[PDB]
From a paper:
As the virus buds from the cell, the viral protease cleaves Gag into several fragments, including the capsid protein (CA) that then assembles into the mature capsid shell (core), rendering the virus particle infectious. In mature lattices, CANTD interactions form only intra-hexamer and intra-pentamer interfaces, while CACTD interactions are also involved in formation of inter-hexamer and inter-pentamer interfaces. Our results show that, like lentiviruses, RSV is sensitive to IP6 in vitro and in cells, where in the mature CA lattice IP6 binds in a pore formed in the center of the CANTD hexamer.
For further analysis, we rigid-body fitted individual CA domains into the EM density maps of hexamer/pentamer unit pairs. Pentamers, on the other hand, organize rigid vertices, where the lattice is curved in different directions.
Author numbering:
A (entry chain H), D (entry chain C), I (entry chain J), J (entry chain F): 10 to 148
B (entry chain G), E (entry chain A), F (entry chain D), H (entry chain I): 152 to 229
C (entry chain B), G (entry chain E): 10 to 148, 152 to 229
Write the structure that this text describes.
């Protein structure tokens, strides 16, 4: 069952990003805090939509896609990925990682249903690395 | 008005990009026409130093995020 | 039977030579067009009398004579010329080529009667080469600068024209055009070419790059 | 048997390009008109030599070469090209497309002899696309 | 009138030759007297730079076309 | 002092590079810290024309010699 | 046995490079002189460390590495390199060329022991070519005009210098020098060259003609 | 004295040649040294207009008579 | 037997050439008068030495040689020259025309002995034409 | 075996030419000194490249070529040239004199191998005469 993040925590994090900036160690610590439980693509996408401005959000979408593509290359380079399965029918496509696959587009409940925990942690680590890249790039 | 937005002589590029994306997304354009307009406004606004920086891009930039990343990488630190 | 060329085509060709000049590729194409069927000496002579001015016509008469003399030297160097015959009685004299022989002076009908098709095609090729020589002679790359108000495509057109229509070898035109793009073409475009992250090794590539990144104004 | 294009039509087209420019819809319509019958490499080459200036002609040679190379890549990607044949002995090299092959250099009659109709239409479409590219690039 | 034709201080040589040949051939002279007159008018008209250029001709020029070719070759580019 | 070296408005780039490399190598830095410092001083000193010239480098320059070669190639002749 | 180069010769060469520069023909001749016997990587490295400044030395290290890499590519493209051997165990790695291999780092005696004469001559030629590249890089013909008061031999010297010390191919220098003599070289000499009864087809012939018939003033 | 003979600014060339040949043949030179001396005096005397006229001779003149004929042909009528 | 021309007539002709010039019709008439009887090479040579200055004399020697060479070409082109004979042993060399042959150098008596009347008239006409050329050239 | 000239002597000679000029008797004496041993085309070419400026060097190349051509004309006029041999296979071409022949272009060692001593002394005398001509011409 999907539970959304508190809008109070999200508002506090957005104001933190607004006053301290993207690169302060306190901001990265707060992001790591709100990045503790494995989030669904819907959660991370809406979170970055709210806390980041338009241009940093575009940059972050780009960087997240690139990092997810590196993850999928490593996944096709190793059939023992915690997102993959043993047979070929469990291979994870980027539509399933970005939340674009069938039964997931716009629906967080179905998303949480079909996604694997390894998928969730890989998406989360990818999003964190992308946030770091964009923060280092913006300023 | 989005079509009247220029990057000031002293303004940074992230502020200009924020202002432009805000004015373009909060306007009367269809949703499928915002990205091309944002790109073509990055190319024609954004005073001629960044204009030439985007023009001489060995890669083809097909997204506002990619253009922003490229410009932030290769911008003239000043 | 001799049929004259249309005065309408001749008038259009004369106006083409008058506006475009003698050396433009469109003018040479038009001349090649009106030089399609083998012409009698009368036809080519009157054609050059009409389309060319007096001084270019004198130059062209000279050049045509020289080229016909080279042809007659090659003809006496080979008895199998399409203008010649097998016996010595068919050897072709310059009076027969220039239309000065007996039964031909001023009469195009008799001309067409006695002349050979090989004679006609040799005369025609000679006249074409003479026209090319005179055109190259009648009308400096290192003095070409891009004006303060001139666009870049006009400057490139002028420079490539003057470099290709000059005395340089064919293998020295591209490097000269490149190095003239780099040193002429006023300092804004000079710096635009200098700061090229890629290496431009062809005039076309330089033109494309400059047209992409030029300062719209 | 090869028949040349009328120098009257070519002169009119050259003056059209001179007054209206390269990109006007009337100019493109006129080019499409003079691009109706499949032309031999000699014809298109001389046509572009006459109607285009020196620098646009260089650009057009470049673009025509690139488009012909794309065509030859598609041809080696499909043995059923109307320019190709069934056996390997009919594979079409760029020397045959640009008119540089043996028995074709400078001779339009031999050109028309050895060339295929599929070869002619491919060359013609390539030249038209190259003209469009150069026209979009010049202004 | 052919005998009144001079090469102007700023006029090129091909224009002067065209004008002179026109006026000489469209005149009352016999046909066998046009070439010598054209030559001797090239030599005495055609302001003293070209006069000296024709005078110091190592070869003997015996035709208006040859004189025109020689002068066009060795003329002072300006 | 290496951290006080600036490229003068009229100074050429090879003189500035000579002075900077001299002051950096004849200082108290460890040997393994001279190249990164020389690079980052080329990037932040070396007045904004050369700063932007180094910034917009399509290739990544990872050595003082490579930076010097690139700048000498693409420098504004004046 | 390794013998070092004289510090007196090295000091004289360093002062030559300091006063004349890197590109003067006397400097290149002196470098060729001190590049006569095949040098060990230690010798050439210390020589360039002493005679070149810091930034030219960095550039020279880069260029030397690139040229040595081209040499090693040619060596793997031909097993008959005078640095290589017949078997695969004599293949020469860049650590052995740059003096970085085992038993060579910092020791010139061991260097001279293990190195081949072909290795030495290849290293030496590579270093010479790298020096030439850096000299051409460390320090415009189409902008050269003959000043109103300048003599013609000075203008010819300046023009030939700038044309031969440029990026043109070797087969394009003479035509460019001629056509620059004709279009530059203020209109008195322009007309003097134009009205040449003979055809001048060489810069030396043009210079001789102009020096003969020039207006003494 | 032959070595002091110059062509005056207003003197014609045949008078100068007469005077020079007279003074050279009526002097103390050997008979086999008169022609080369007369030629080399035509070339170095005979004020610079005729000097340049003789210098730019497409043919090689190897006799005083040939030089005189050439100069009389191509001289500047004045 | 050789008889020299009167030095009185030669002095009068020299003064005529001195006052009237080389090209006046009276001077040419006087030269034609003193060119009435066929002269030996010695006579014409001394006459031109006396009446002409040094430079016109050099020019006249050149022109006389050229005209005599044309005469000898016409003579080898026709064996019926009044200077020639029927057999090959009477062919006239330029040494015999210019007075340089054996038995003639410096001796006018021997000259008059060996020379033919056709030789004399040819030499005389050649000298007259050469005088005309030099007179037209000098002024 | 080829030995190069000392760059010290060449530097001193270059400075002599720079201060005294090309025509001073001391400069010609110094050139005669450095022209004592028979030099290979490489040596003389590099020497004139170093001591002479660009325009005098062009003039000197011209004059050297002309003098070498006169030498080769005299050589074809006499089969007993110290550069020639007795048979026709030893005839010396200008490519061998200017150092342009096969096995000589750019290589002084091979040059010294194939060249004759008569060839060397002829090249040297030709270069000296050319230097004299250019020195008399420059000033």
């Amino acid at each position: 069952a999907w539970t959304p993040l508190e809008p109070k925590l999200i508002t506090r994090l957005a104001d933190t990003v607004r006053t301290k900036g993207l690169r302060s160690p306190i901001t990265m610590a707060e992001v790591e805090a709100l990045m503790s439980s494995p989030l669904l693509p819907h959660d991370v996408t809406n979170l970055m939509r709210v806390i980041l401005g338009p241009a940093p959000y575009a940059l972050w979408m780009d960087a997240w896609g690139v990092q997810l593509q590196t993850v999928i290359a490593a996944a096709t380079r190793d059939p023992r990925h915690p997102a993959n399965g043993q047979g070929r029918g469990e291979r994870t496509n980027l539509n399933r990682l970005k939340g674009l696959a069938d039964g997931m587009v716009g629906n967080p409940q179905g998303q949480a249903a079909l996604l694997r925990p390894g998928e969730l942690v890989a998406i989360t680590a990818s999003a964190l690395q992308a946030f770091r890249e964009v923060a280092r790039l913006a300023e």
